[PDB]
Amino acid sequence: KKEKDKDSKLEKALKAQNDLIWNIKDELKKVCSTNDLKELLIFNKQQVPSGESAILDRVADGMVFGALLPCEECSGQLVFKSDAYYCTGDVTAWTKCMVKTQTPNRKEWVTPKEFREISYLKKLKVKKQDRIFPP
Amino acid sequence: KKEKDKDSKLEKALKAQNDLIWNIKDELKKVCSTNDLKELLIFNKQQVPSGESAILDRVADGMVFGALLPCEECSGQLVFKSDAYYCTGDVTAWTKCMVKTQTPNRKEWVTPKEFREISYLKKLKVKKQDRIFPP
Ligand SMILES: [Zn+2]
Ligand SMILES: [Zn+2]
């Protein structure tokens, strides 16, 4: 009964959350190259996936939700899937970690000063020149 | 003879310079409000003109050409006109400064750290939230 109501409230909050992620991705693409995004993952101790889209996705997620901590069981990298985060690590050379959670451990995402200023650096900072006047 | 050639070389350099100014204005409008631009003028010891367009114009000029120093004769504010910079100061309560130059004294324009990061602050920095999963 009110289960439906609760679901709808959640759906609305999820739409807002996904809108935010879309905006963060749209803004990162304006100022960061794939190289810049890899550096951001590396700095926050996240694995760098293959594929330019996956790199962008994991940076924007990190900036919205915080940096994922390594798996507490195997120290592998947790990855978002539609229904939960899943560890991708190896317990042994012959056994995969099965860790899965909707509430993974986080720490705050850190954006270093050089990246905080990256739009200014790329778009506004120029070497001083002399004014030229029309003949 | 070669006067025409020299003029054309200069015209081409001037077009490049004005293109740059246009781009700097276009980028500032994306990240700075009129308030932000007034703060930038004030920080670099420039008078704040009336009119939102004039404020934008003087910040972009400052970022391309450097901060104008006060008039060495009367300490007034130099202002760009089409043919030269002209001092707008008062020598006495009854006499205007007549200083005019195409090569006014400058110092480097400074953009404080908070403004260097202003795009990140406005567009990328969010308070951490919890991931929501679909029901
Ligand atoms: Zn694990
Ligand atoms: Zn003067």
Helix crossing, B34-43 with B52-65: angle to 10°?
Answer: 50
Facing B120 at nearest CB: one of A14, A83, A116: A116
Which residues of chain B are within 8 Å of residue A119 when distances are taken between CB atoms?
31, 119-120
Closest CA to B135 of A129, A98, A14: A14
Distance CA A6, CA B135 (A): 10
CATH number at residue B15: 1.10.20.130
CATH number at residue A98: 2.20.25.630
Distance CA B13, CA A132 (A): 8
| Tokens, residue A54 | 């996956």
Give the experimental resolution in Å: 1.7
Q: Are A71 and A89 in contact (CB under 8 A)?
A: yes
Distance CA B48, CA B38 (A): 6
What size, in residues, is chain A? 135
| Tokens, residue A26 | 């749209």
Contact A24 B109 (CB under 8 A): no
Q: Which of A22, A39, A66 is the C-terminal boundary of a domain?
A: A66
If asked whether residues B39 and B91 sit together in one domain, one would say no
If asked whether residues A28 and A58 sit together in one domain, one would say yes
Facing B124 at nearest CB: one of A63, A85, A130: A63
In a domain, A119, yes or no: yes
In a domain, B132, yes or no: no
Q: Find the domain containing A23 and state its range.
A: 1-66
If asked whether residues A105 and A83 sit together in one domain, one would say yes
If asked whether residues B53 and B4 sit together in one domain, one would say yes
In a domain, A121, yes or no: yes
**Residue B123: CB partners within 8 Å, gap ≥ 6?**
A23, A27, B31
10 Å CB burial of residue B49 (0-12, 13-18, 19+) is: middle
CA atoms within 13 A on the CB side of A14: 11
Distance CA A119, CA A116 (A): 8
Distance CA B56, CA B31 (A): 12
Question: Tokens 């006067």, residue?
Answer: B3
> Is B32 part of any known ligand binding site?
no
